[PDB]
Each structure stands twice: as C-alpha cells, then as structure tokens.
Amino acid sequence: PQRLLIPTVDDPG
Amino acid sequence: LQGEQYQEIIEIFGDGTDYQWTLDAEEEM
Amino acid sequence: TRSSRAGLQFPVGRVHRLLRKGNYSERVGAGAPVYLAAVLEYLTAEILELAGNAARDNKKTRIIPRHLQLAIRNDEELNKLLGRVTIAQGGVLPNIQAVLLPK
Amino acid sequence: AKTRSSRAGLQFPVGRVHRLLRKGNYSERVGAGAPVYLAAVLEYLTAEILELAGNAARDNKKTRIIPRHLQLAIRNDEELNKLLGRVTIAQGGVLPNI
Amino acid sequence: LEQMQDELIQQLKLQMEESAIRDANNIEQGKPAIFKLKLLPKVKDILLRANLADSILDNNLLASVRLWLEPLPDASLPAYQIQKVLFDAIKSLPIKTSHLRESGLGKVMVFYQKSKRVEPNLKRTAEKLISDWTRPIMG
Amino acid sequence: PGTVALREIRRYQKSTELLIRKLPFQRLVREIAQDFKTDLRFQSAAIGALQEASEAYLVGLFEDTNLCAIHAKRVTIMPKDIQLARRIRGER
Amino acid sequence: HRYRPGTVALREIRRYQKSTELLIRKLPFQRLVREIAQDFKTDLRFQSAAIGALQEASEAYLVGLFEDTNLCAIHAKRVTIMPKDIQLARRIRGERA
Amino acid sequence: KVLRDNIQGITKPAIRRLARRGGVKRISGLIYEETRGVLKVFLENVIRDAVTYTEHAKRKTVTAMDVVYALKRQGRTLYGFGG
Amino acid sequence: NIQGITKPAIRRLARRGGVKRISGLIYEETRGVLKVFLENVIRDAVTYTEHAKRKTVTAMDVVYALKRQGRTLYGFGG
Amino acid sequence: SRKESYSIYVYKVLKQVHPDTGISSKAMGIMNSFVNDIFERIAGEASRLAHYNKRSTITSREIQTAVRLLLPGELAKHAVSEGTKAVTKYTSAK
Amino acid sequence: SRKESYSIYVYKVLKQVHPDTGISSKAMGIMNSFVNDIFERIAGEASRLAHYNKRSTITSREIQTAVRLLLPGELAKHAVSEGTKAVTKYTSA
C-alpha cells in the first residue's frame, strides 16, 4: 500500500 | 496497520463511495 | 381526550406513552395509566395544599422551595415518604435541643 | 467449540444468560459480548469468594464449605463486605469481636 | 451558565438544518441558495467563540457542519464563503476521534481532498487536517 | 461478676444456631399476621427466614446499643441507647 | 459590653436555621471540586449547575451529620461535639466500618 | 382460635442471649420490654408487605419468596432461602 | 484547595445544625469526611460522564450519581 | 427542543386547590422532579410485581398494590380511593 | 419441573479453585442467591444507563461501566480485566 506507510511518532527522525 | 483500527479509519473517513458518484459527476462535467 | 373522560387534569396519553417507552412490560393495560395518574394528581394536590398553607402562614402568595420543605418535613406521612430526598434551598426545620437552651 | 462458553473459555452458560437478558425486559436489543462479559465477571467473582471460603474452611479443619465459612469470608474481606454490607446470611453467625 | 449554551447551540443546529433544507428546495425550485449565506454571520460568530467549543462538541454540531458541506444532489458545491468559514472553524476547534465518529466528517473531508473544483488551498488544508486526524489512531 | 457473661458471649459468637424458640416465634408471627388477613397459611421456610432476619436485625441493633453505651462510658445498655440508635439509623 | 458565651451561639443558630443561603463560598468549593476531579481525568469541565448541586448536597449531608453528632454529644451528657462523636455517628449510620 | 399476647414468648434469657451475641455485658431490666416493642414494630412492617404480596398473587399461603421480596424492598436482602 | 473550607464555614454549618460548642479537631475531621463524600460522588459522576463521552460533567451526571447513593435531589432536572 | 414537563398540570392543580396562590419556578422544578421520582418508584414496583407473578401486562391491579406497598396507611387508603373513583368514572362513560 | 440453578457451575468453579473441598447444600443456596442478586443489580443498572442515554441496546460498554460503578477499586480493575480478556478471546475465536 501507500497510505499506510505515512510516518508515526516512533519512526526515525 | 491493524485490522480493527483500519476498520475504524474506514468508518471515520469512508471508502469515498458516499461521494464517489459526486466525483464521477464532477469529472463527467 | 382521555383525561376528560376520566374527569382528570393530568395526561393519560403522555403517561401511557412513558409506560410504553420505559421498558416496563410487553403490554400495558388501559386501567393502569388512569389509576396512576389519579394517584399522582392526589399526591400533588396534597403537597400543594400543605405548601400553600405554609406559604400563607409566612404571608406569601407564591410558593418557594422553603414552603415545600416545611410542608414535607412537617407532615408525618409525607416526611416518611420523602425520607431520603434533599430539597435545594429548603433549609431545615427550627429545632433547638432542650439541654442547650439557656438557664 | 459448539457452546458459546467454550468459544469464550468460560464455565458459566452464555446461552442461559442471553435468554435471561432477552426474556427479562431490560432493553429492546442486546449485544453479542454483553452476556460474555457478564458471565466472565460472575465467574471471576464466584472464584474470588470460593477461594476465601476454602481458606476459612481449611483454617477450621473442615472439608465442606458451610454458611459459616461464607459469612467469615464475606465479613473478613474489606471489598466483599463493602459490596455485601446490606446482606444477611442464614446460619452465618457473627465474627468473634470483643 | 453551560446548559444554556447547549440549548442555544441546539437552536442554532435546528436553524442550520432548516436553512439547508430551504436552500436545497430553492435550488430545486430554480432559485439561488441564499439562506445559508444569511445564516453564515451568526454561525461564524458562534464558531469563533472558543469557550463554546466544548458545548458544540457536546451537541455534535459537526453533524450539521457536514450537512452544509455535503454537496447538493445537483452536483453543485457550496458557496466559497461557507467552505472557508467552516474550514477555519474546523481548524480552530480541537476535533478528536470521538467527535469525528459522531459526525462522520472524514468522508466529506476525503471528498474535498479528492475533488478538483475545490480550491487548491482548501485541498492542502483538507490533506493537513486528514493527516492530523489520522495521527492519533496510529499513535 | 462478668466472667461467665464473657464466656457465654464467646460461646454464642462461635455458633450460628437460632436463639429464639421456634414455636413461640411461630405463634407470635401468626398472632401478628392475624390482623392483615384472617386465617393465613405459612410455609415453614417463611418462618425460618423471618427468624433469621429478626435475629440478625436485633444483633445489629445490640451492636449499635453497645457502641452507644460504651460511648457514654458505661457497660450497661439502657433504653435511651436503643432510642438513640434507632434515631440515628433513621427508624420510626 | 460582653455577652455570656453561648448567647451569640444561640443567636447564630436561630439565624442559620431560618435562612437557606449556601454557607460555603463559591470559588473555594469550585477549586476544591476541580482539585479532586483532576485526580481522575485531566481537562474535565463541570456545568455551574453541577457545582451548585454538589454544594447543596454536600451542605445538606454535613448538616445532617452535625445533627447526629449533636445528638450523640447530648447523649454523652455534654455540650461540645468531639471527633469521637463524629466517628460514633458515622459508625452507627453504617458509613465507617 | 385467636392468639392473644404472645409477645412474652420472647423470654428474658432469649433477649440476654441475643445481647451476649451482640457483645453486651450488663443489661438493664427495661431493655427486655424495649426490645420486645422494637421487634413487634419490625415484624409488623415486614409481614404487612409479605401479606401484601401473598394477597396480590391471589394465594392463601405465605411463601418464602414473599418474605424474600418484602425484605429486599427494605434493603434486607437474605441469602440462603432462595433469591 | 481543601483549606478553602475555613473554620467559620464549618462553624456556620454546625450552627445551622444546632451545635452550641465545637472542639478544635472538628474542623479537620469534617474536612476529611467531606473529602471522602466528594471523592465518591465525583467518581460516580465522572464514570457517568465517561459513559456519555461528554467534555463536561453535566448536572444530570451529578443527579444520577446522587440517586445512585440514595441522596435523591429535587430541583435540578430530575 | 420541545421537552415535556408537568408545570402546567401542577399549576392547574394549584389553582384548583389554592386559587390565590402562585408558585416560583424553582418550586415548579422541584415538583416536576418529585412527580418523575414517584412515577419511577411506582413503575419499578409494578414491573417487579408483574415479573414475580409471570405476567406480560401492567394493569390497574399492579398499580393499586404498588401504591399499597409504597404509601403509608391513610395516604395509601386515600390514594386507592381516588384511583378507584377515577377508574370507575372513566369506565362508566366512554 | 426442571428448576434452573447455578449449582453445577459452582461445583466446576470450586474444583477449579479447590479440588479437595466440598460445598454444603445451604452454601449452594446462598451462592445461587448471590449470583441471581448480582445479575439483577447489573442488568438493572445497565437498563438505567441505556435509558439515561436514549439507547435501546445493552452492549459490553454498558456492562463494563456498570461494573465500574458497582465494584470497588481493585475488584473493579480485576473484573474489568477479566471481562475484557474473555470478550476479546471470544471475539477472536
């Protein structure tokens, strides 16, 4: 998918 | 993501079919 | 109207609808709401009678919560019935214990 | 797992609780997990009580639980006695308190 | 104080629904939608007041907001003033997942995002708001 | 004076058996029931439940009375302690 | 001049059993309510009527408790209410175990 | 046959035993009558309701469930006899 | 915020309750009792509010919480 | 918001018993709360009685016996008198 | 007549908890009364909530908040955890 890959808080800065 | 909150996201934001016909009419016009 | 047929002032249709929509029984007979409306009308008439007496006793022509509290706590049967309820702005009855009075 | 109790890992009857909730005139509709949740709570509470009743019956060197041990368990547990403070137990006696 | 604000907001909700129905009928009767424009100043003044946001969320006025934002069956978009004011109000209030669930505004927001007759600035704001509302669900 | 009384207290607190005699209590219950409807029948379990409730109620009342009597720096319970207990409980 | 101790007490008793107005200041009670509520969920509102109802209920409760306490104090053949009187009243009511 | 003044079937040793179970060490002599009156008023209040239930079911026997409901109405829930 | 319940206020409440003389520890005892009462009532009210998902505790939440305790209150929409 | 109450009926009853007496709004609120409370008590008792007796219907017998259970002697007697009077007067006509 | 009681379920729970303990008939009567009483309390409070919120369905949320109202702190916490666990696993299965 493409929409689900949007970043989260725990994703690398 | 996870399935249940994916369903919750669908509930909040919809699949678009509530206005997919509106979009189709807009593109037709 | 069904209140007129029974010689009542309280509503029969409203009470029947509230009994119907209150999840009380599968079906509701037609003599229950009339009887219950009559009981409620009797009780409110008693309450308002004593509260009007209490308000005249204070020389007022309009009933306030204080007179309701006095009427309730002054009537034995009502005070037993309304034993757990508190009335906002109702106050307390004047009551001074015997041993606290001066000498 | 045919019975709904098995599908939830319970011992109380989900179907009977469902029937009583429906044929009990509580609300127009009933969910699907309300009976499960209530059966779980009831089973947990009964286990909670039976643990302390077994403890009290074992402190009196007795194999059978009697109303005395239920009374002791309830009146000795702070939370259970608060829950069951307005409940009289038949043949329960009193707590030794001098 | 606050019971009164809820009553006033419910009255505003009824007025907004009635105005939307009247404007829809007028468009169906060959007349322009004017009632929404007439009610717009009062709705703007109410929405701009921050302390009433809690009462708005307790009366779920976002349902009527979405009803106004919903395009009419003639495939005609609402007036640009209404869209701009409603977008500004949506930005100005702390919308949470529960409020979106009550109102279901996400569907209209996605429609606005996907549509092309919508102003590009409104398109960007819709994308931003949708991302912000998806933020709490995923973390 | 005061030791056999404590021994009896201990004994009776160790037990659960009903203290009021069963047949006098039955007669009392029937006598009281004779006012509300003539010639009533009673289940045995009804009388048993009535006796259990009555004894539990009286024991609680004696607990409150003992508390009041101790409050008054006494050890003897007197009728005014019962009256105070029933007043505070909200009893008429 | 000077009054006998207890004469102004009885004057106040007569004055306060006549009136019905709330005897606690509104802002302190609101601050207390918010302080307590903040320990269960942050960012709660209360309606002003919710605070008013709470104040009415709390004062009614406290007045009933003070009446029972006065009864206990008079029972002990005294005139001064004491913490042990309050504890005894709350125990007899069934509020403290 | 009518029952007359059976309140004295609550003997003095019975009231003493109830007091000992309640923790009372020394008992005044007016207590016994006090207690008797109290008990009367209790039973009259419970029985009047139990009988009210029995009469409403158009029955002639007072059952245990009638007593249980009468107690439950006063917040006197009783476990052991049904419920 | 519990020191906002001043000594004169407790004195006033005792005078409306008919109390003639007051000890010095009565004030702290009363503050503790009031805190317990308010804790229970507000906890019930917030439970109701959480069930309603509202951003305010309403007067209805307080009225139902008092009905839950048995302290039925008239005059607030009950 | 068209929400219902008993204010007009309470006012009519007041003018029926006390012609030259008014009522404040706060007391009208208290009387409405009182009516709702008593209704709720009576309906809950009637429901419990119906479920005890295995019946699907709330009739006037359940209402009468709930009144008897709830109100004290003279009050219950007068209320039952009033209810029976009203029921017979309503049933006699149509 | 087939009378319904929770006796067999209490035996099951007891053997789960105390394999070498037995229950008297009267203690089983008390336990049945307790279970019925708790069911009545919870269902009545759930109905009261549903009517308060103009709802016509009893879902697990109403039962959960009823348990929150009725039970004290630790009891409420453990019973809520148990119920959510059981409902989750019944849904999953």
Q: Across-strand partners of K57?
A: D29
Residue whose C-alpha is closest to residue C29's, from D27, J93, J64: J64
Q: What are phi and psi of J63, to 5 degrees?
A: -65, -40
CA–CA distance, F81 with G74 (Å, rounded to integer) = 12
Q: Which amino acid is at I69?
A: Q
Query: C-alpha H66: how far from its chain's center?
Result: 14
Instruction: Pick left, alpha or beta for residue C91 (phi over 0 → left; psi -120 to 50 → alpha; otherwise beta).
Output: left
Q: Which amino acid is at J76?
A: A
Residues of C with CB under 8 A from a CB of D: 23-26
- Check contact E-B (3+ Cβ pairs < 8 Å): yes
Residues of D with CB under 8 A from a CB of F: 67-68, 71, 88, 90-98
Closest chain D CA to residue J51: D24
Distances (CA, A) of G60 to G21, G46, G54: 12, 20, 10
For residue E3, give both structure tokens. 């019971």
Measure D21 CA to nearest chain F CA, in Å: 29
CA–CA distance, J59 with I56 (Å, rounded to integer) = 41
Q: What are phi and psi of E48, to 5 degrees?
A: -65, -20
Closest chain E CA to residue G47: E2
For residue C40, give both structure tokens. 């409620």
Is the Cβ of D66 closer than 8 Å to some Cβ of chain H?
no
For residue G2, give both structure tokens. 């000077």
Concatenated DSSP letters of chain A: --STTS--TTS--
CB D86 within 8 A of CB H75: yes
DSSP state of E76: B
Is the Cβ of D1 closer than 8 Å to some Cβ of chain H?
no
SS3 B24: helix
Name subunits touching E (3+ CB pairs < 8 A).
A, B, G, I, J
Q: Which helix (H) or strand (E) holds C61?
A: none
Contacts of K51 in chain C (CB under 8 A): 22-23
Other CB atoms within 10 A of residue C80 CB: 12
CA atoms within 13 A of residue J33's CA, in its CB half-sphere: 24
CB F63 within 8 A of CB H24: no
For residue D7, give both structure tokens. 């599908």
Q: Which amino acid is at J73?
A: G
CB J57 within 8 A of CB J63: no
CA–CA distance, C87 with G57 (Å, rounded to integer) = 9
Measure J48 CA to nearest chain I CA, in Å: 19
Measure F13 CA to nearest chain D CA, in Å: 6
For residue F19, give both structure tokens. 């203290």
Q: Name the domain count of chain F.
A: 1
Q: For residue F41, what are the domain limits?
A: 1-92
Contacts of G49 in chain E (CB under 8 A): 1-3
Measure I43 CA to nearest chain K CA, in Å: 9
CA–CA distance, E90 with E108 (Å, rounded to integer) = 13
Most G CBs within 10 Å, among C86, C93, C101, to test the G interface: C86
SS3 K22: strand
Helix and strand numbers, DSSP H then E, in chain H:
3, 3
Is the Cβ of F89 closer than 8 Å to some Cβ of chain G?
yes
- Check contact B-D (3+ Cβ pairs < 8 Å): no
Contacts of F55 in chain D (CB under 8 A): none
| Cα-Cα end-to-end distance for chain F | 36
CB-closest option in B5, B12, B16 to E100:
B12
Concatenated DSSP letters of C18-85: HHHTTT--SEE-SHHHHHHHHHHHHHHHHHHHHHHHHHHHTT-SEE-HHHHHHHHHHSHHHHHHTSS-
Measure H2 CA to nearest chain D CA, in Å: 31
CB contact under 8 A, H71 and F31: no
CA–CA distance, I38 with I49 (Å, rounded to integer) = 16
CA–CA distance, J43 with H25 (Å, rounded to integer) = 48
CA–CA distance, G71 with F89 (Å, rounded to integer) = 12
Q: Which helix (H) or strand (E) holds H78?
A: strand H77-79
CB contact under 8 A, C102 and G4: yes
CB contact under 8 A, I77 and J29: yes
Most D CBs within 10 Å, among F3, F9, F13, F16, to test the D interface: F16
CB E58 within 8 A of CB E97: no
3-state secondary structure chain G: CCCCCCHHHHHHHHHHHHCCCCCCCHHHHHHHHHHHHCCCCCCCEECHHHHHHHHHHHHHHHHHHHHHHHHHHHHCCCCEECHHHHHHHHHHHCCCC
DSSP state of F41: E
CB C2 within 8 A of CB J91: no
CB pairs under 8 A between C and K: 3
CA–CA distance, F43 with H63 (Å, rounded to integer) = 5
CATH classification of the domain holding C17: 1.10.20.10
CATH classification of the domain holding G90: 1.10.20.10
Q: Name the domain count of chain C.
A: 1
Q: Across-strand partners of F77?
A: H27
- Check contact K-D (3+ Cβ pairs < 8 Å): yes
Measure G15 CA to nearest chain C CA, in Å: 10
For residue C62, give both structure tokens. 């309009």
For residue G55, give both structure tokens. 């104040």
Write down all domains in chain H, each with its CATH number in brackets. 4-83 (1.10.20.10)
Q: Which amino acid is at A4?
A: L
CB D44 within 8 A of CB K35: no
CB contact under 8 A, F67 and G91: yes
Distances (CA, A) of B11 to A7, B8, E99, E107, K58: 21, 5, 12, 9, 22
CB K85 within 8 A of CB D43: no
Residue whose C-alpha is closest to residue K51's, from K36, K60, K62, K40: K62
Contacts of I71 in chain G (CB under 8 A): 57, 61
CA–CA distance, E132 with B4 (Å, rounded to integer) = 20
For residue G23, give both structure tokens. 């005897």
CB contact under 8 A, G76 and F80: no
Measure E101 CA to nearest chain J CA, in Å: 24
Rg over CA atoms, chain D: 17
CB contact under 8 A, E3 and G45: no
Q: Across-strand partners of F37?
A: none
CB D23 within 8 A of CB D12: no
Crossing angle (nearest 10°) for helices D14-22 and D34-59: 120
CA–CA distance, H47 with F47 (Å, rounded to integer) = 11
Resolution to 1 decimal place, in Å = 3.6
Distances (CA, A) of G22 to A2, E2, E119, G58, J92: 62, 21, 57, 10, 53
Write out residues 25-84 of D within 8 Å (CB-CB) of J.
25
Q: For residue C4, what are the domain limits?
A: 1-103
- Check contact A-F (3+ Cβ pairs < 8 Å): no
CATH classification of the domain holding J33: 1.10.20.10
Token pair 């349902």 in the structure block, residue: E63
For residue F55, give both structure tokens. 């004894």
Contacts of D74 in chain F (CB under 8 A): none
| Cα-Cα end-to-end distance for chain K | 36
Concatenated DSSP letters of J46-76: HHHHHHHTT-SEE-HHHHHHHHHHHS-HHHH
Q: Across-strand partners of I74?
A: C87
CA–CA distance, G30 with G48 (Å, rounded to integer) = 9
Concatenated DSSP letters of D66-92: -HHHHHHHHHH-HHHHHHTTTEEETT-
Name subunits touching A (3+ CB pairs < 8 A).
E
Measure C52 CA to nearest chain J CA, in Å: 7
Residue whose C-alpha is closest to residue G63's, from C74, I13, C88, I12: I13
CB F7 within 8 A of CB H30: no
Is the Cβ of J79 closer than 8 Å to some Cβ of chain H?
no
DSSP state of I4: G
Q: Which amino acid is at F59?
A: V
Q: Across-strand partners of C96?
A: none
Residue whose C-alpha is closest to residue I21's, from E86, F81, G79: G79
SS3 F51: helix
Q: For residue J89, what are the domain limits?
A: 1-94
Write out residues 14-43 of C within 8 Å (CB-CB) of I.
none
DSSP state of D3: S
Q: Name the domain count of chain J.
A: 1
SS3 K18: coil
Alpha helices in J5-59 (DSSP H): 7-17, 25-52
